[PDB]
């Protein structure tokens, strides 16, 4: 289960977050720029949890 | 002068107007859709003036 969850997380998200996201889904016209909340703290916590899982 | 003005108008605009315009100039992000005012009456008047100039 540990390995499966780690692989799924790696495939879907990764281990980092960026502040700006580009969206190309309807009904948005041709493109849209969107902005996230607290994109730096969450990376730190993600890394912490990754280390715990590996241990 | 008549011929020169007709050629310039043909090169720059044409002889019609569309209701939706696509803009890709900064600072607009990646693209923008814009909408015009009275895009059908102006075509009629443009055609009238073209006919007058040719006559
Ligand atoms: C341990 C339980 C994990 C559940 C696995 C079921 C498959 C998860 C989705 C796989 C990715 C889907 C991409 C479209
Ligand atoms: C700029 C942010 C870079 C983050 C990339 C992911 C780094 C993962 C670090 C893993 C180190 C710990 C391994 C045991
Ligand atoms: C964009 C820069 C992000 C900075 C990442 C620093 C993460 C530090 C995590 C340390 C985890 C240690 C686990 C024992
Ligand atoms: C500023 C760039 C930071 C690059 C990522 C930092 C996290 C990697 C170190 C992880 C600590 C591991 C402790 C066991
Ligand atoms: C991030 C990966 C951590 C791996 C180290 C985990 C501790 C293993 C200790 C090895 C010594 C075994 C003594 C019983
Ligand atoms: C009869 C007076 C007409 C003036 C002609 C001067 C040139 C007009 C501009 C030509 C097109 C410029 C495209 C960058
Ligand atoms: C759907 C709008 C079509 C407009 C295209 C321009 C047509 C020009 C008509 C010229 C006819 C008169 C020539 C003497
Ligand atoms: C998109 C459809 C626009 C309809 C264009 C009709 C223009 C009629 C102009 C007639 C001019 C006659 C000059 C004598
Ligand atoms: C509905 C489509 C209309 C196509 C353009 C109509 C304008 C062309 C006729 C111009 C009249 C010329 C009179 C001398
Ligand atoms: C749209 C172009 C109009 C061209 C016709 C202009 C009238 C020319 C009449 C030709 C007969 C000459 C008799 C002197």
Dump the DSSP string for A25-37: -TTSSS-EEEE-S
Interface contacts (A, B; CB < 8 Å): 12
Q: Give the whole-angstrom CA distance, residue B45 versus residue B16.
A: 10
Is B31 in CB contact (< 8 Å) with chain A? yes
Documented resolution in Å:
3.0
Rounded Cα distance between B22 and B43, Å, is: 19
Q: Write down the experimental method used for this entry.
A: cryo-EM
Long-range pairs, B28-32, Cβ under 8 A, ≥24: B29/A31, B29/A32, B29/A33, B30/A30, B30/A31, B30/A33, B31/A29, B31/A30, B31/A31, B32/A29
Residues contacting residue B39 through CB under 8 Å, at least 6 positions apart: B17, B18, B19
User: Can you read off the two tokens belonging to residue B52?
Assistant: 């007058």
């Amino acid at each position: 289960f540990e390995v499966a969850f780690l692989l799924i997380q790696w495939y879907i998200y990764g281990f980092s977050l960026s502040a700006v996201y580009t969206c190309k889904r309807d009904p948005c016209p041709h493109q849209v720029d969107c902005f996230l909340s607290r994109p730096t703290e969450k990376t730190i916590f993600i890394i912490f949890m990754l280390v715990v899982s590996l241990v």
